[PDB]
Design a protein around this ligand. Structure first.
Ligand SMILES: *[C@@H]1O[C@H](CO)[C@@H](O[C@@H]2O[C@H](CO)[C@@H](O[C@H]3O[C@H](CO)[C@@H](O)[C@H](O)[C@@H]3O)[C@H](O)[C@H]2NC(C)=O)[C@H](O)[C@H]1NC(C)=O
Ligand SMILES: *[C@@H]1O[C@H](CO)[C@@H](O[C@@]2(O)O[C@H](CO)[C@@H](O)[C@H](O)[C@H]2NC(C)=O)[C@H](O)[C@H]1NC(C)=O
Ligand SMILES: *[C@@H]1O[C@H](CO)[C@@H](O[C@@H]2O[C@H](CO)[C@@H](O)[C@H](O)[C@H]2NC(C)=O)[C@H](O)[C@H]1NC(C)=O
Ligand SMILES: *[C@@H]1O[C@H](CO)[C@@H](O[C@@H]2O[C@H](CO)[C@@H](O)[C@H](O)[C@H]2NC(C)=O)[C@H](O)[C@H]1NC(C)=O
Ligand code: CLR
Ligand code: CLR
Ligand code: CLR
Ligand code: CLR
Ligand code: CLR
Ligand code: NAG
Ligand code: BEF
Lengths: 1174, 371
């Protein structure tokens, strides 16, 4: 992100001897244009993956046991059957991550092979007037097809219509005169309007390849600094007339960024400067982190606690084995024939309980995560059939986070809103025409208390009837060649009635003049379609102007043709040509576009301006007006502002010939002037429009994604607070936040700005302005003027939405609001008490910094739902990257975790899938750490007898077939196929997700309780068989000889396996035919495999365990009481804590079995615009 | 300018969508108290059965570890800290036994030699099956090196060389692999070497009416299937030698017709099964045909095993048994306690539900709909 390290790009000029050190290769090298989003580089995949795997401390412990059982010979058997499990686990993780990176590489190869045209015919010398008309051109120089990966610095690139620009290019030529290309920056910024880019002045002479092959020049450019509104270059060439070097500045407007889509333009020819990583996106992109989960870290801490227990056990074993060796007289010095002795005893007891944390922990968690990701991928309600895109996860280890997600940082381009603009309402002569049932009004009516579903369907039916009536009336009134009902966004029926003359003559005349003015003041171009010649489409610089012209052509006021001085208008069928005398273009600083036409009648002039509401209301005449249309129009606009409709205003005025003569005189004074002629045109534009007569206003709704106002409601009910890290500007963001029910009508909008209207009171350096604004907003409404006394107490609240305000920050105010530490804490403490924190004009780095601020400070789980190449940084640095997929966003879906079809799927990827996965892992981890304590503890409890000499109580084949076959599959099934409540009741009652917010399911006290239960269980599992043997040790129903330590081992293993499986089944929330089947199958596996191993050849010491143990009534008499006494405490505690102190889930399940949620279907989804009333 | 040119839906199943057939249970006092009551009744009934069965088993345990010292050459009683009679018919029939010692000066093993004669009376019968085992308290046979000390090739009768006996896997006889002369012991390891050596009689010599003595048999005391692993020796009669503690049983070595066939030697197979815990009770005499009537009986035990040198103990244990092995009331006690605990827990839950219960399913008892 450094602006230094400049560069120089030549064309048709060999580099001087200063850059090439006699090898023909310049010292400077430029990175390849290949985009690389893979997590692990294909050259360093194995070392990075092995280091990432060995981050976990259990892997280091396994490696330590390996290297200390291999070097220390004659302590264990051959180590060839101890390294294989660890190596297999590591290679399994390696193959899994390699498959993930292969998927990402497939995506990168699909992205990199896009077609582009590169100048072929002249070799490149970089990596391996203007036109000299004297020399003949080159007939082989053309624009040949090529890919993006082979676009080197200095290659002339031609971009066709609707073609994505490969890399940063210096504009050289365009089909249009003056070279005014239009680019769609919807990926690099929030601007929905097409940005205009001018080419170079001297480079306009060339028009084809035959002219550029004779061009020779060089561009000295600054280093890539990752900024979207700044660039400094120097174009330089040599004149063909005389001998001299000519220089020309190159600003940002002559730059074609990577993610920019060349739209509404035939072809743009330019020269590439930055490539690959040097582009303005790949620097604001990031480094595609590994994205570790959250439960993994607490898992490492739990592994450390298990290490502590193992060390305690081994210490108390090595003490007693070493105190017993110093006691006389023992039976060892007769028949059996202290530093190093105690040391070898300790390191024998270490290998004894070497499985207090088994090798199957980091291979069970990985299997569970992959299975949960696959079950996410194969969900039918997360499939968007509009483009055949299921919810494909790209980071498989991030699956339990979605159950702990608390903050959601949305976008506003392809995430909250679609890319359509529909004209909805208008105000003509103080009369409001237009019908619409906005989902904001639906949420408002729901909050009032009235019915929404039935009433909503009724209202929609009425709108449909009014629409068909309007279509019939407009088709019966006249015939228009451009008319089409599918593009008729307007629906009102009173408009056509008052346009045909059902409300007098003046009203009809005013409506006609307004509809004509809508098709006059615009820079819209008309292009005949490719397939249908009669269907002439409107190519405009902005979508709102396109919507205005479309709803004008619908009402019988079509605008066609762009003549020299004039434009054709088909009014109801009759074609008339006007005369656009002047067109004052819509500037970003003017916010109003004006047209001065010559209307006959000497004739008169007509000035029609279209602009914002307040901007045009300022340039009005409160004296010569209706004085009744102004109040009505203001009320209607204030009404439309509360419905997400970005309203405009239209004002016309008549002029005589002397006024227009005076105006063109001062214009010719100002137009052909020098020394900053801009201010002159601004003031003449201001003085011509100092007075105007408002003749109507408009209203264009920016349609959101389906079911967004209800998905937001579900998420806010679950407790998931959401911020809107918007793009383009402020007013668009405000009306959108009004559209989706984020901004209410009574919420005060705390504006945090730098050079606004409330900054004159604190007029100083912007830092002090922002500080004073934040402090005054943290003082009167909610007095918390402080940093470490309120933030430290608010961090231990887990997040509860409250405050009833909203906050709007700009780009510069944000850049200042998170540059200092105290400012960071103050800004964050402010936003934490707000309801609807927004943002405006935020660069990628700034939104990434906001996400990092919310993540690091006030540690929570953030979500980064968003589409666009500018949203990549915040997606990567948010631990959950949900990139909206489609045929538009092909860079924020790659460098992300999940790629859902549209935003309305988040409230299912997070509310039912995420909660499920989080609860499943939070129940699996303690179960897994408890099912191993109950086993190795028995090996220890056999130590207080035998005096800790190191004799295995179980056979050498039960230590490797207990953590592998007897009890692993039930735990995997509890973690893959468990459900708190069905998805219908999950999305019906989202408040249960609050449990995942407070971190109330996976805490260390739960793990300690489970380990204590394992200790008690193991005590019982060992001391019931012993107490059976404790009196006379002859319990076999025929004498005949029991009591081999392997038989007691079978007793203990049976009790422990049955207790562990029934424990897994007790804590499971639902009992289905799969988990119960596999639990019974695991029990049968234990029994039948004992039966197969004992009754076999290579079972030397055993050889009859099954026939000699399972056939006695004492075995079952011990097994039943063992299972009952291991399950009775936990079951009683559950039955009391689910009767005396029931949590939320218990009450939800009780009322679910009572019959509260027994009307809704199986695949219920409240975020669906097509669900019936169920 | 010539450059002017031109089915993934997830399979809706019952398993892919995680909508498998299931039952979602809840622990309501309508489905908890019946379970507790059923479990309690079942466990109390089973425990009553087990205790009624255990209150009938009769046993006789007599420790004789100090017969070579504390006993005399006349019929003298045994101290009260050496014998225990448990007879359910007569629960107060002490009638202490009478033991005597008859020293044999032939053996030069002063530690333990001679013969102990024990006369014990039984006032009841033992139906159709009588077991006589030897108890060895304070003998540690479950240590790390002691237990792994043998060879399963010599147990299987193979002619295992010195390498297969010494350089084997983690289960091998390391200390006693080879003697001084260079001949690998046939029974190797500290288990076979340290075998129990007291010679028990083949009958219970009667006292009352000597015309009918009660007989026993050393055949059928170990599992029959165990004869599928203990095979006959296949050694060349010149490369083996008895273990260092077996030198008094084979003072001349291993000649032609003295090599013991461990297959039909069920006591040796009984000893190659190292006991798990401290006490070691191994069956040595079995009677399957005749009932043992009342009266006095006499045992002639040949004391060849030194036990008092580590303050250990040993003795005889005579019993009929039961379906749950020897007399051990732990199972019945645990069943009774489990049943009583389940019943008390059911009663406590009933009290808490009828005195301090809650609503069935309320919309105001949740966490958010209450504050
Ligand atoms: C039953 O097995 C017994 C194993 O404990 C065994 O006792 C052992 O007898 C041998 C003699 O054969 C002793 O060996 C030592 O004896 C001589 C003379 O006393 C010593 O000078 C030597 O050092 C030699 O090692 C063992 O010490 C002894 N073991 C114990 C623990 O006392 C019995 O002999 C066996 N029974 C029969 C009938 O032989
Ligand atoms: C082999 O060595 C045997 C000694 O273990 C011997 O057995 C007897 O006969 O040895 C003693 C000599 O009479 C006697 O006192 C033992 O009681 C006998 N033992 C048994 C088990 O009968 C064999 O006679 C010897 N055989 C040969 C062929 O030398
Ligand atoms: C049953 O056992 C008794 C007790 O040993 C036998 O009576 C004596 O047995 C010993 C040897 O066992 C002889 O030396 C005595 O001479 C026997 N005494 C008498 C009076 O006979 C008894 O003979 C045995 N009965 C049978 C049928 O074998
Ligand atoms: C119980 O009866 C069985 C069946 O008769 C006895 O088994 C046989 O006993 C005789 C002794 O006279 C042996 O010769 C046979 O070899 C035995 N048959 C076998 C081993 O298959 C058994 O000995 C009797 N036991 C008692 C204690 O009376
Ligand atoms: C790296 C560390 C964990 C290795 C283990 C070091 C400790 C736990 C081991 C190594 C040396 C061992 C000690 C060696 C000597 C004795 C003296 C003996 O009378 C009691 C046991 C005692 C006190 C041992 C206790 C355990 C011991 C202190
Ligand atoms: C009976 C005499 C001779 C030996 C004493 C051994 C017993 C009583 C002592 C020695 C080591 C002690 C153990 C040391 C460590 C632990 C692990 C802990 O999680 C539970 C307590 C427990 C299990 C202690 C229980 C009592 C204990 C087992
Ligand atoms: C030779 C005869 C005496 C052996 C009898 C052994 C009997 C007591 C043992 C062996 C097989 C055992 C059964 C094996 C299977 C089960 C099914 C289980 O759901 C309930 C216990 C039950 C029913 C066991 C009851 C006790 C049982 C019947
Ligand atoms: C929110 C949670 C932590 C509140 C605590 C609820 C639990 C842990 C408390 C509240 C009531 C308590 C129970 C009250 C009565 C009994 C019956 C007694 O014979 C055994 C203890 C036992 C079973 C107590 C165990 C702990 C208990 C269940
Ligand atoms: C829940 C706790 C407080 C009380 C549990 C009740 C248990 C421990 C008590 C109540 C009745 C008692 C039993 C009463 C009768 C006998 C018969 C006797 O020959 C052996 C002891 C035995 C079998 C007692 C064992 C302990 C016992 C079962
Ligand atoms: C045998 O032990 C008993 C038990 O204390 C004792 O009274 C008696 O004196 C002992 N006999 C001899 C000979 O030591
Ligand atoms: F294109 Be955006 F609003 F980050």
């Amino acid at each position: 992100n450094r602006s230094d390290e400049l560069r120089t790009v030549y064309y048709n000029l060999p580099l001087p001897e200063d850059m090439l050190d006699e090898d023909g290769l310049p010292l400077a090298v430029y990175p390849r244009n290949k985009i690389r989003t893979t997590k692990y580089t294909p050259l360093t995949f194995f070392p990075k993956n092995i280091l990432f795997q060995f981050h976990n401390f259990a892997n280091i412990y396994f490696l330590i046991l390996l290297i200390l059982g291999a070097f220390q010979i004659f302590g264990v058997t051959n180590p060839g059957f101890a390294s294989v499990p660890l190596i297999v686990i590591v290679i399994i993780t390696a193959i899994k991550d390699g498959i993930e990176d292969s998927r990402r590489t497939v995506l990168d190869l699909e992205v990199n092979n896009t077609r582009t045209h590169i100048l072929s015919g002249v070799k490149n010398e970089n990596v391996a007037n203007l036109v000299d008309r004297t020399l003949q051109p080159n007939p082989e120089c053309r624009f040949a097809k090529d890919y993006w990966k082979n676009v080197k610095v200095g290659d002339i690139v031609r971009v066709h219509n609707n073609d994505e620009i490969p890399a940063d290019m210096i504009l050289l030529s365009t089909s249009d005169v003056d070279g005014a290309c239009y680019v769609e920056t919807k990926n690099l910024d929030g601007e929905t309007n097409l940005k205009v880019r001018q080419s170079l002045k001297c480079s306009k002479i060339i028009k084809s390849s035959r002219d550029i092959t004779r061009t020779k020049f060089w561009v000295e450019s600054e280093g890539p600094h990752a900024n979207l509104y700044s660039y400094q270059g120097n174009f330089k060439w040599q004149d063909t007339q005389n001998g001299n070097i000519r220089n020309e500045p190159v600003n940002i407007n002559n730059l074609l960024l990577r993610g920019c889509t060349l739209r509404n333009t035939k072809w743009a020819m330019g020269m590439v400067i930055f490539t690959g990583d040097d582009t303005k996106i790949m620097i604001n992109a990031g480094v595609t982190p590994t994205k570790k989960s959250r439960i993994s870290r607490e898992l490492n801490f739990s592994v450390i606690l298990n290490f502590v227990l193992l060390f305690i056990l081994c210490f108390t074993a090595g003490i007693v084995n070493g105190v017993y060796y110093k006691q006389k007289p023992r039976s060892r010095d007769y028949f059996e024939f202290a530093s190093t002795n105690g040391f070898v005893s300790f390191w024998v007891a270490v290998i004894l309980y070497q499985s207090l944390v088994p090798i199957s922990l980091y291979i069970s968690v990985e299997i569970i995560k992959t299975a949960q990701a696959i079950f996410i991928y194969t969900d039918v309600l997360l499939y968007n059939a509009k483009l055949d895109y299921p919810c494909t996860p790209k980071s498989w280890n991030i699956s339990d986070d979605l159950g702990q997600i608390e903050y959601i940082f949305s976008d506003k381009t392809g995430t909250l809103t679609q890319n359509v603009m529909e004209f909805k309402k208008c105000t003509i002569n103080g009369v409001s025409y237009g019908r619409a049932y906005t989902e904001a009004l639906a949420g408002l009516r729901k909050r009032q208390g009235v019915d929404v579903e039935s009433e909503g369907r009724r209202e929609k039916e009425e709108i449909a009837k009014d629409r068909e009536t309007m279509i019939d009336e407009l088709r019966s009134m006249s015939d228009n060649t451009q008319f089409c009902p599918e593009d008729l966004t307007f629906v009102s029926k009173e408009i056509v009635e008052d346009l045909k003359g059902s409300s007098g003559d003046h009203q009809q005349k005013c409506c006609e003049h307004f509809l004509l003015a809508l098709a006059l003041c615009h820079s819209v171009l008309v292009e005949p379609n490719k397939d249908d010649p009669k269907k002439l489409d409107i190519k405009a610089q902005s979508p709102d102007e396109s919507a205005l012209v479309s709803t004008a052509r619908q009402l019988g006021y079509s605008f066609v043709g762009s003549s020299k001085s004039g434009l054709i208008v088909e009014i109801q069928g009759v074609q008339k040509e006007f005369q656009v005398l002047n067109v004052l273009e819509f500037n970003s600083s003017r916010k109003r576009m004006s047209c001065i036409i010559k209307i006959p009648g000497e004739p008169k002039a007509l000035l029609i301006c279209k602009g914002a509401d307040s901007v045009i209301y300022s340039r009005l005449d409160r004296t010569q007006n209706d004085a009744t249309l102004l109040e009505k129009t203001a009320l209607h606009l204030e009404e439309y502002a509360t419905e997400g409709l970005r309203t405009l205003c239209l004002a016309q005025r008549e002029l005589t010939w002397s006024e227009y003569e005076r105006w063109v005189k001062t214009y010719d004074v100002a137009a052909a002037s020098v020394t900053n002629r801009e201010e002159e045109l601004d003031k003449v534009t201001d003085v011509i429009e100092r007075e105007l007569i408002l003749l109507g206003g408009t209203a264009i709704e920016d349609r959101l994604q389906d079911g967004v106002p209800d998905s937001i409601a579900l998420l806010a009910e679950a407790g998931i607070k959401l911020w809107v890290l918007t793009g383009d500007k402020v007013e668009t963001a405000i009306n959108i936040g009004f559209s989706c029910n984020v901004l209410n009508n009574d919420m005060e909008l705390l504006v945090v700005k730098a050079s606004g209207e409330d900054v004159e009171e604190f007029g100083s350096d912007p830092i002090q302005v922002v500080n004073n604004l934040v402090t005054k907003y943290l003082r009167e409404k909610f007095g918390m003027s402080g940093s470490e006394e309120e933030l430290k107490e608010a961090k231990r609240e887990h997040g509860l939405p409250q405050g009833n305000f909203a906050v709007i920050i700009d780009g510069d105010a944000l850049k200042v609001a998170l540059n200092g530490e105290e400012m960071r804490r103050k800004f964050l403490l402010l936003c934490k008490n707000c309801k609807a924190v927004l943002c405006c004009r935020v660069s990628p780095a700034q939104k990434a910094a906001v996400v990092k601020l919310v993540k690091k400070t006030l540690d929570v789980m953030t979500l980064a739902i968003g589409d666009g190449s500018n949203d990549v940084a915040m997606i990567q640095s948010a631990d959950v990257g949900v990139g909206i997929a489609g045929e538009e966003g092909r860079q924020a879906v790659m460098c992300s975790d999940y790629a859902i079809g549209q935003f309305r799927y988040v409230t299912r990827l997070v509310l039912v899938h995420g909660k499920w996965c989080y609860k499943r892992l939070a129940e699996m981890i303690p179960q897994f750490f408890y099912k191993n304590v109950i086993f190795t503890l028995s090996l220890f409890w056999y130590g207080i007898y035998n005096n800790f000499d190191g004799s295995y109580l179980f056979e050498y084949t039960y230590l490797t077939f207990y953590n592998l076959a007897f009890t692993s599959v039930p735990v995997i099934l509890l973690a893959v196929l468990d459900q708190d409540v069905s998805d219908t009741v999950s999305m019906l009652v989202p408040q249960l997700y609050r449990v995942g917010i407070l971190r109330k399911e996976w805490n260390q006290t739960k793990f300690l309780w489970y380990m204590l239960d394992g200790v008690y269980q193991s005590v019982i599992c060992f001391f019931f068989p012993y107490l059976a043997y404790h009196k006379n040790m002859v319990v076999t129903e025929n004498g005949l000889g029991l009591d081999h330590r392997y038989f007691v081992g079978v007793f203990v293993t049976a009790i422990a396996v049955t207790s562990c499986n029934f424990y897994v089944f007790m804590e499971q929330y639902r009992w289905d035919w799969f988990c119960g089947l596999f639990i019974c199958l695991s029990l049968a596996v234990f029994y039948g495999w004992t039966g197969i191993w004992t009754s076999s050849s290579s079972s030397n010491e055993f050889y009859k365990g099954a026939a000699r143990v399972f056939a006695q009534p004492a075995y079952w008499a011990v097994l039943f009481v063992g299972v009952l006494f291991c399950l009775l405490p936990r079951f009683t505690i559950d039955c009391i804590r689910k009767i005396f102190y029931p949590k939320d889930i218990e009450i939800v399940r009780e009322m679910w079995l009572r019959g509260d949620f027994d009307l809704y279907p199986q695949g219920y989804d409240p975020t669906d615009p097509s669900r019936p009333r169920i | 300018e010539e450059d002017e040119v031109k089915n993934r839906r997830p399979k809706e199943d019952a398993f892919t969508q995680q909508r498998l057939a299931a039952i979602n249970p809840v622990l309501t006092p309508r489905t908890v108290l019946p379970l507790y009551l059923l479990i309690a009744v079942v466990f109390v009934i089973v425990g009553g059965c087990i205790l009624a069965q255990n209150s009938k088993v009769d046993e006789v345990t007599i420790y004789y570890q100090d017969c070579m010292t504390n006993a005399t050459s006349s019929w003298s009683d045994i101290p009260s800290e050496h014998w225990q009679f448990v007879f359910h018919k007569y629960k107060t029939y002490n009638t202490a036994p009478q033991w005597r010692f008859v020293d044999d000066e032939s053996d030069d093993f002063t530690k333990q030699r001679g013969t102990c004669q024990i006369r014990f009376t039984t006032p009841s019968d033992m139906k159709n099956n009588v077991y006589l085992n030897y108890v060895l308290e304070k003998f540690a046979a479950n240590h790390r090196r002691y237990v792994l000390s043998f060879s399963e090739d010599q147990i299987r009768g193979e002619d295992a060389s010195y390498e297969t006996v010494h350089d084997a896997t983690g289960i091998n006889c390391k200390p006693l692999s080879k003697n001084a002369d260079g001949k690998i012991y046939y029974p190797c390891g500290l288990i076979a070497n340290s075998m129990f050596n007291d010679t028990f009689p083949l009958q219970l010599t009667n006292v009352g009416d000597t015309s009918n003595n009660y007989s026993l048999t050393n055949k059928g005391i170990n599992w029959e299937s165990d004869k599928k692993r203990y095979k006959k020796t296949k050694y060349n009669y010149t490369q083996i030698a008895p273990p260092p503690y077996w030198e008094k049983m084979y003072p001349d070595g291993y000649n032609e017709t003295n090599i013991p066939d461990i297959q039909d030697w069920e006591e040796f197979q009984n000893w190659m099964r190292p006991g798990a815990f401290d006490k070691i009770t191994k069956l040595i005499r079995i009677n399957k045909n005749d009932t043992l009537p009342a009266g006095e009986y006499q045992l002639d035990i040949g004391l060849h095993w030194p036990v008092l040198e580590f303050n250990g103990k040993k003795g005889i244990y005579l019993t009929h048994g039961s379906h749950l092995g020897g007399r051990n009331p732990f199972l019945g006690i645990v069943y009774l306690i489990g049943g009583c605990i389940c019943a008390a827990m059911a009663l406590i839950l009933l009290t808490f539900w009828l005195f301090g219960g809650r609503k069935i399913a309320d919309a105001s008892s949740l966490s958010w709909n209450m504050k």
